[PDB]
Design a protein around this ligand. Structure first.
Ligand SMILES: Cc1cc2nc3c(=O)[nH]c(=O)nc-3n(C[C@H](O)[C@H](O)[C@H](O)COP(=O)(O)OP(=O)(O)OC[C@H]3O[C@@H](n4cnc5c(N)ncnc54)[C@H](O)[C@@H]3O)c2cc1C
Ligand SMILES: Nc1nc(=O)c2c([nH]1)NC[C@@H]1CN(c3ccc(C(=O)N[C@@H](CCC(=O)O)C(=O)O)cc3)CN21
Length: 496
């Protein structure tokens, strides 16, 4: 078949939906906020590429009279992964990022601002801009993992080294439940998801999304706002989606997908019954890439769900989308409690010894040549589109770790290279769980390829779509085609 744009909306539809959505959440009046004499501030964007429900943007605006929005294309983002040195950012996510930047500049311009784009390290670019424009502060969202917090440290020290006079203000964001509202400090986050969930749902409230004014200007006088970099300048060979889902970067496209899934298609009311699907855009929200880049936020999604429940229907599916967003919150907070044990072979559980790093075995998994259609189709979906269904990710993870016996980080780093929605907290969090090195032993499980195939792809419709040489075969053969109609198997399945 062809490439399915996600969202499937036309460029005009995306623009009108974005306008209506921005309109719906616009700040009624800026009456009560005085900006006179507050000076210049720099807003440093990272993975919060949106205008809507952006607390850093709001705080920057309300504490200044002029804002200089900046995005730094950090050279380290295009180097290599930590342990196995795969590309740090694969071509597909890189392409999605560029679309996100183009859209952010466009949306900032609509509110009277613009986005200064520079290529280089934030700790070198920001202190320089702060001095040049006499900014009193640099606002940004707080991140949680080692690499990102190290950059925060370098930027903070860079600003001090040019004087006091300039402060880095990090704002908590990204989560549906706010860190400050939790019924426990993250150091004491429950190691069992169910307990974390029951606690926040019983003792916490979700904050309303932050309303942003329609007028946010002016910016300082800038001679060159910068071109959006090209992947080629960054040393990445562009790659386009040849088949399947083609996700469209940017906040505009993101709110367009929320509109598309919830309202236009009215699929939210059946979400829970379909979320284990693997084929097509319809089986789940597909919000992950926009959430990862911060093109959309969970507080916004929650308010849309509330409106849906009021106007259309409230049931187990409308609630389940929130259940899943809580999983995202959980791994984000867990990243703080775990620190770098999140990336260590033994994981947070600080487990065992073992594991092979057999390059040949790994490559067969990576290149979709394991000989098992269920596995191969998923790995091909990933390298072709930068996305994989949640069901598929759990399965390929179990296969790599349990059937192939490989160092789980090889799989985690490959996902890091390929996923449009790559998020360290969620990626490594879910990998530690699947690998059995997280701190909830009740989640340690082996996925039977035959059973999974039977339960989630009975007609072999999914593997057939991705592995066209199986399309002619009847089911039964689709999943056990044999070595001639398909290919040899690289390893026996660990469980009979
Ligand atoms: C090995 C492995 C690696 C993963 N890597 C990532 C990753 O790098 N980034 C990422 O965002 N998700 C990751 N996931 C979680 C989950 O598979 C994806 O969020 C989901 O497939 C994204 O598609 P969706 O938006 O249609 O999902 P939906 O089912 O529509 O869920 C809605 C939202 O809930 C959140 N969510 C749902 N399930 C999970 C989960 N298990 N953990 C965390 N958040 C969840 C996401 O933000 C998602 O967009 C991983 C899962 C596994 C098993
Ligand atoms: N977005 C993102 N953020 C990250 O921080 C991150 C990724 N992705 N991808 C995976 C890598 C690997 N992660 C790691 C892994 C190990 C240490 C580590 O062992 N640190 C030592 C101290 C420094 C040293 O001696 O190496 C430690 O004792 O914790 C740090 C970060 C950070 N990683």
């Amino acid at each position: 078949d062809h490439i399915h744009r996600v969202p499937a909306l036309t460029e005009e539809e995306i623009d009108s939906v974005a306008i209506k959505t921005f309109e719906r959440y616009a700040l009624p009046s800026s009456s009560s906020v005085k900006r006179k004499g507050k000076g210049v501030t720099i807003l440093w964007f990272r993975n919060d590429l949106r205008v809507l429900d952006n607390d850093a943007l709001y705080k920057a605006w309300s504490s200044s009279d002029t804002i200089l929005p900046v995005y730094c294309l950090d050279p380290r983002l295009f180097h290599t992964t930590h342990f196995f040195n795969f590309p740090k950012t694969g071509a597909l996510r890189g392409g999605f990022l560029m679309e996100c930047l183009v859209d952010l500049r466009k949306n900032l311009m609509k509110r009277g601002l613009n986005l200064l784009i520079r290529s280089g390290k934030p700790e070198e670019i920001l202190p320089s801009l702060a001095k040049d424009f006499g900014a009193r502060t640099v606002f940004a969202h707080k991140e949680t993992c080692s690499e990102e917090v190290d950059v925060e440290r370098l930027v903070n020290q860079g600003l001090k080294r040019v004087g006091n006079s300039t402060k880095l203000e990090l704002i908590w964001g990204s989560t549906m439940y706010h860190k400050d509202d939790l019924p426990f400090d993250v150091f004491d986050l429950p190691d069992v998801y169910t307990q974390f969930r029951k606690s926040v749902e019983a003792k916490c409230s979700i904050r309303s999304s932050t309303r942003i004014p329609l007028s946010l200007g002016p910016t300082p006088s800038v001679d060159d706002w910068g071109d959006v970099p090209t992947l080629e300048k960054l040393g990445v060979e562009p790659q386009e989606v040849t088949r399947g889902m083609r996700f469209v970067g940017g906040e505009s496209a993101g709110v367009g997908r929320v509109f598309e899934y919830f309202w236009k298609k009215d699929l939210l009311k059946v979400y829970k019954e379909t979320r284990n699907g693997m084929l097509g855009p319809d089986y789940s929200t597909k919000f992950s890439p926009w959430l990862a880049f911060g093109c959309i936020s969970p507080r916004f999604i929650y308010e849309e769900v509330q409106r849906y429940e009021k106007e259309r229907v409230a049931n187990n599916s409308t609630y389940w989308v929130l259940f899943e967003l809580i999983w995202r919150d959980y791994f984000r907070f867990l990243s703080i409690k775990c620190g770098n044990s999140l990336f260590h072979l033994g994981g947070p559980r600080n487990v065992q010894g073992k594991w092979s790093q057999d390059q040949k075995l790994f490559e067969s998994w990576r290149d979709a040549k394991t000989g098992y259609p269920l596995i191969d189709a998923n790995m091909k979906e990933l390298s072709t589109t930068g996305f994989m269904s949640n069901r598929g990710r759990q399965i390929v993870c179990s296969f790599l770790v349990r059937d192939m016996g490989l160092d789980w980080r090889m799989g985690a780093e490959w996902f890091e290279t390929c996923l449009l929605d790559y998020d360290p907290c969620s990626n490594y969090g879910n990998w530690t769980y699947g690998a059995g090195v997280g701190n909830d032993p009740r989640e340690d499980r082996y996925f039977s390829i035959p059973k999974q195939a039977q339960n989630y792809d009975p007609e072999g419709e999914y593997v057939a779509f991705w592995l066209q040489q199986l399309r002619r075969l009847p089911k039964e053969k689709r999943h056990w085609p044999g070595r001639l109609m398909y290919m040899d198997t690289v390893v026996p399945l660990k469980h009979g």
